[PDB]
């Protein structure tokens, strides 16, 4: 903890495991004198939050919506300030530095994905914009204003640096594709249906995706189907984030604002709820090194590890 | 000579913050009273009972200061027209909540969003909170000349930009406030934040907001065009509008980023300043006439 | 806020269609509860809530002898002008099987827990009459498996059209008050020059007892009333249906309306500026049941096709009293 | 009924007086419940009842300091706006010794129960601002053997000729209301331009706690009053002294008036009609103080030397919210 910040804010924004077993945290202020934010390493994931018993930490100018790793030392930031942020790993892993941070969006950007590359990464933001970036060049190649309303999350193809979904308050899905001249692609269930809320691509097929409504359901899409096979009533409230196991036949982790997460497999059926937190579920990552070991952060301050059948 | 301000959806430090936005020669500073992130529930525990403070101490700034510099920003997830039940709910709540705490600080505006046609419910809080407790602070609705769905690029190939005459469809946004207002039985303590996109519309909608009581218009950095040095400007057609606008004496909003980096904010400000000071001066009627701009006077009988 | 006068008493009690079905209610309601094998063995306590000079008492007394199951009665009533008529039937004719409560239901702190709770607290509009908060504030002395009459009840709106009406209450403008009060309240009224625009279509609904683990009895409401005529918008008629239990129910909605029951005429919630609306044109009023600790009270408004402006806000003309 | 803004709070900050004045009202009962014996081994556990922005909660710190005694603190405040700023200095500064509640007192329910309960809920006529009502209602929190601050306060009334004043209140007749509801409420006034008629003479007096067993807040008071000028009674003047602890004690009645402290001005109760009076002879002002549930008011009248009416009847110009 050389430099590093003396204290953890009170919200748990981002969690996510390297290949390595470390584990990355975003944690924003949302709360008190001063609104910013802060990034961790835990080169050991059961000393988090504790922030004595860290590898590695940092204070950004202001908090975090989203994160992503970018290899092994690179860290995607999704700031208040309307700005991308990369933030390079140390030598040694002990310091995390500032490489690029870009001022382009005009209004909170809200998430961010990493496309199969590492080398591109979208931008989804509240000015409604997505851009996609050069994380070498360090500038936007393309800015796509498709939407009507603020974009909630932008989720990059397993597979393809031309392909991403993104969903907004406008009650579109988009399936991209940038090298289309109309990249943009207007996709989803029969009906209107309530707002989109989260994205989840599936691993073994560019096929097939979740999507998270904002009354608590669950759907599965395939892309050519071009309908909505499956769905299921998982959370009592907003589904913020839709995280797949790396397993073989791979399970789904689901967060809410209800507190819960649930656990389902490729049926939407639930396997796993925990009540461990008091406070929105944010993030889910699961080891590597255990694929039935799963780590949640919450705004309740709690890093919690699940046993998962 | 021109009165502006400045909108952030960030504020880390409100200390530092404004002392920047007025060290760069703004008047005054759009910001939000709660985390814009910051979501709250009032009915479902455990969410519920989550430990405070629910936001940033009134102490860290002046009465003067919260009186004449600070203008509130409803947080932007607050929704009270949503069709699911839990999310109306809760920001009736959140509302109430974000406008009181507005009343508590003195504030002398609180911007609010109008960004679809339905805000029957968005009317209703705020009218119920206009009719509860006293206070004359002012409500500035955020409305922009086009709708946020006309302004898009047409680059969903399954559903195209229809490019079709549309009179009564490109004023649509002045029915959005006509009908919010109507709702709230033309409230004086409701007004027009104009909103101005980078494509204006066809002057018979910039006809519309003619006689509307327009107390800002929010200029996003977008619009402004670049000249041979560097320096940010405007259109002629931008121009014309903000000689208008100056002629109503409204105040000025600049809101996003810096995309003329190698120059800073008071260039932005500078060149309104610039325009301001070059319209074309008043004449004999105007000289003698200000002050008396839409005051009433009863019929006095001269025998 | 305010208690009931005799002769107010004396008239609806004379309506025999309503108690007819609230005997009925209570008849095929014992039978469910109480096996012919137990007829002797079980007796089931039954609570008049809202008692008045006790027609509902008498009646609870009548589906007994029709059932012939045994039956414990309290007999809870806020108004004590007409706790001096109950407790005089008491002592006459009644005797030990009814219980007498001088107390608001609100209040009482039960001696046992009830089987069945019998009450009559509907309005014209259904919830008017604050039927809901007054049996939340009574359901923790129901029995976990108890049954409430009546069960469910639901309020239902209708556009109306009368230049006649419209004159009726712009007329009951008073002296120190807003002088457009008189539009933001509600008026019963024997509607009859007048001319509904659209089928009636439900607005609210409650059922007792409420499972629901967070009670809240405000509400918001949109209705699109679809218009076959040329026409001006002056009001909204408003009616109900209640089920008292299973298939039996009272109703005031002219098309399922109770025959030859005269105990509730409908309401009129008007609008200060007459809305002209053509043929083909979709009239959408909005509708919210609003409260505090103290009131509870309806704003409403239209939104197609023009706005209004909303009535009621703060329920500032027209609030109802806890 | 409605929370007080930032900058009200603010002012009222700056009464160095009135603090001085709560600080010791602490530091002197500090000393008479915890021996020097037990200073170190008894911790007093200490409820500010509407706390603010703590000015009163900093105050018993400071009282804690001087006496050299332990404690333990609660910050009950209904605002939530000003527990924001609780919440804010309890994180920054004060830190676990201050537990804070956004909960009203008469609702809260206590982890454990108290000491001494401190509040400053007077209004210029004591009671007006509801000090009974809530104390009332948060009694049952404090332990068996616990001290009220304060534990005594009592209003007081003179009869003021002030023609000037008079002018002032007829003014404030408005649009929508009783043309009269102007002069059926009393006005907060730094009184300036009058003529006090009488020596003012005690109206009523409330203890905290309330040991009596049917607790009533209720209040009737005849007052008689000797005028020794020909004169014109426009009104009556309202003061209060307040018994915070033993000998320490707030007063805005000009006789025994607290040097230096500006933080209530006098209260106005006028007529609607000025009464005549002579050299010799004596007004005799009659004071109610009533109370639903829901709101609690003061009715008053003059029945001597000539009857007025009774001012404020059912509270319909002027009622305090509950
Ligand atoms: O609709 C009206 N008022 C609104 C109110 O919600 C309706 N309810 C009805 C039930 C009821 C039952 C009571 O108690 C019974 C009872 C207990 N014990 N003893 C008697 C009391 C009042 C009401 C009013 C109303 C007003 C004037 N006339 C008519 N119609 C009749 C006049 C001759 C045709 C109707
Ligand atoms: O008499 C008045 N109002 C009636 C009311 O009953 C009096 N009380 C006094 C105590 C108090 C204390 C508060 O809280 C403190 C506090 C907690 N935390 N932080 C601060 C709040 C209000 C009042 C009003 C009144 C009105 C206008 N001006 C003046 N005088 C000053 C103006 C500059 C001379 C007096
Ligand atoms: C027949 S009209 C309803 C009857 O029930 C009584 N009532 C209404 N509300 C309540 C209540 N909350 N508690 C007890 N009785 C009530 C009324 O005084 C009237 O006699
Ligand atoms: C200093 S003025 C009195 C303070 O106590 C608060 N207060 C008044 N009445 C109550 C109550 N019943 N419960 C809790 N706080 C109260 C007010 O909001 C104010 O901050």
């Given at each position: ?309 | ?84 039940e839990?999310?109306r709910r809760?920001?009736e ?27 029957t419910n968005?009317?209703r ?179 | ?120 607290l509907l309005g014209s509009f259904a919830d008017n009459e604050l039927s809901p908060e007054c049996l939340d ?11 409430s009459?009546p069960g469910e009840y639901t309020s239902f709106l209708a556009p ?25 309240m509600p008026?019963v ?10 089928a009636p279509q439900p607005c609210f609904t409650f059922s007792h007892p409420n499972?629901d683990?967070?009670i809240d009895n405000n509400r918001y409401c949109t209705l699109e009333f ?10 909204f008629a408003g009616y109900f249906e209640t089920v ?5 129910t009272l109703s005031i909605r002219?098309?399922t ?7 509730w005429?409908p309401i009129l919630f ?14 959408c009023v909005r509708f919210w049941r609003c409260s505090?600790?103290?009131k509870v009270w309806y704003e409403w408004a ?9 009535h009621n806000?703060?329920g500032?003309?027209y609030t109802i009293?806890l």
């Open positions: 903890p050389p430099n590093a910040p003396a204290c953890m804010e009170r919200q748990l924004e981002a969690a996510r495991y390297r290949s390595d077993g470390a584990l990355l945290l975003g944690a924003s202020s949302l709360s008190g004198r001063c609104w910013a934010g802060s990034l961790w390493l835990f080169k050991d994931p059961c000393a988090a939050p504790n922030e004595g018993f860290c590898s590695a930490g940092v204070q950004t100018e202001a908090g975090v919506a989203d994160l992503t790793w970018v290899g092994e030392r690179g860290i995607l930031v999704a700031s208040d300030s309307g700005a991308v942020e990369l933030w390079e790993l140390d030598e040694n892993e002990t310091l995390i530095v500032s490489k690029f941070c870009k001022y382009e969006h005009d209004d909170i950007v809200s998430t961010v994905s990493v496309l199969s590359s590492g080398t591109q990464a979208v931008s989804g933001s509240k000015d409604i914009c997505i851009k996609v970036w050069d994380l070498a060049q360090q500038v936007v190649l393309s800015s796509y204003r498709a939407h009507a309303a603020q974009v909630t999350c932008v989720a990059a193809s397993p597979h393809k640096d031309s392909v991403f979904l993104s969903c907004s308050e406008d009650n579109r899905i988009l399936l991209w594709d940038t090298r289309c001249p109309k990249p943009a692609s207007q996709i989803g269930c029969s009906a209107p249906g309530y707002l989109p809320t989260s994205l989840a691509w599936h691993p073994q097929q560019s096929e097939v995706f979740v999507f998270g409504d904002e009354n608590g359901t669950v759907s599965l899409v395939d892309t050519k189907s071009t309908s909505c096979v499956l769905s299921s009533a998982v959370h009592s409230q907003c589904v913020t984030g839709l995280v797949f196991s790396p397993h073989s036949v791979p399970f789904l982790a689901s967060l809410s604002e209800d507190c819960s997460l649930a656990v389902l497999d490729s049926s939407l059926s639930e396997l796993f709820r925990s009540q461990a937190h008091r406070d929105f579920v944010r993030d889910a990552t699961w080891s590597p090194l255990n694929h039935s070991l799963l780590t949640t952060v919450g705004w309740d301050h709690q890093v919690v590890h699940h046993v998962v059948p | 000579r021109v009165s502006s301000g400045r909108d952030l959806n960030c504020v880390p430090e409100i200390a530092d913050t404004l002392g920047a936005v007025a060290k760069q020669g703004f008047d005054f500073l759009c910001m939000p009273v709660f985390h814009p992130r910051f979501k709250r529930e009032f009915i479902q525990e455990p969410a519920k009972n989550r430990p405070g403070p629910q936001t940033r101490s009134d102490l860290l700034l002046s009465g003067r200061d919260w009186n004449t510099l600070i203008v509130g920003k409803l947080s932007p997830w607050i929704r009270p027209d949503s069709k699911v839990k999310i809760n920001s709540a959140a509302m109430l909540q974000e406008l009181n705490f507005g009343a508590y600080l003195g504030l002398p505006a609180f911007l609010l969003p109008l960004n679809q046609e339905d805000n968005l009317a809080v705020l009218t119920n909170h206009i009719h509860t407790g006293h206070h004359s602070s002012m409500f500035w609705m955020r409305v922009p000349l086009v709708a946020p769905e006309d302004l898009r690029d047409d680059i969903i190939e399954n559903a195209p930009t229809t490019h079709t005459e549309e009179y009564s469809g490109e004023e649509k946004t002045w029915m959005w406030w006509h009908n919010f207002r109507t709702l709230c039985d033309y409230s004086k303590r409701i007004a027009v934040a104009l909103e101005i996109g980078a494509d204006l519309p066809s002057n018979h909608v910039i006809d519309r907001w003619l006689g509307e009581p327009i107390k800002a218009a929010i200029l996003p950095t977008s619009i402004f065009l670049t000249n041979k040095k560097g320096f940010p400007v405007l259109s002629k057609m931008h121009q014309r509008l903000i000689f208008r606008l100056l002629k109503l004496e409204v105040q000025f909003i600049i809101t996003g980023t810096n995309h003329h980096s190698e120059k800073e904010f008071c260039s932005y400000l500078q060149y309104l300043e610039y325009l301001s000071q070059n319209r074309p001066p008043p004449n004999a009627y105007e000289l003698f006439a200000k002050g008396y701009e839409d005051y009433l006077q009863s019929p006095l009988q001269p025998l | 806020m305010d208690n009931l006068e005799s002769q107010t008493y004396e008239v609806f009690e004379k309506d025999p269609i309503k108690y007819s079905q609230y005997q009925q209610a209570i008849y095929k309601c014992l039978l469910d509860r109480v096996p012919e094998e137990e007829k002797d063995t079980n007796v089931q306590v039954l609570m008049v809530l809202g008692a008045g000079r006790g027609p509902l008492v008498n009646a609870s007394l009548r589906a007994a002898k029709q059932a012939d199951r045994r039956i414990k009665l309290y007999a809870v009533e806020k108004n004590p002008n007409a706790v001096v008529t109950l407790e005089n039937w008491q002592f006459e004719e009644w005797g030990s099987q009814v219980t007498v409560v001088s107390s608001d239901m609100r209040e009482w702190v039960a001696p046992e827990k009830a089987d069945i709770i019998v009450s009559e504030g009574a359901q923790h002395f129901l029995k976990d498996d108890g049954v009459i109306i059209s009368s230049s006649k009406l419209y004159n009726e209450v712009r007329a009951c403008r008073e002296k120190d008050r807003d002088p457009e009060a008189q539009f933001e008026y009224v024997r509607l009859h020059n007048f001319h509904q625009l659209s499972r683990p967070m679809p218009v076959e005529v040329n026409t001006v918008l002056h009001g008292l239990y299973q298939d039996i002219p098309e309306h109770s025959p030859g029951m005269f105990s005429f008007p609008i200060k500026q007459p809305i002209t609306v053509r043929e083909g044109q979709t009239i505090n600790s103290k239209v939104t197609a096709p023009v706005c209004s402006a909303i806000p703060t500032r003309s009293g």
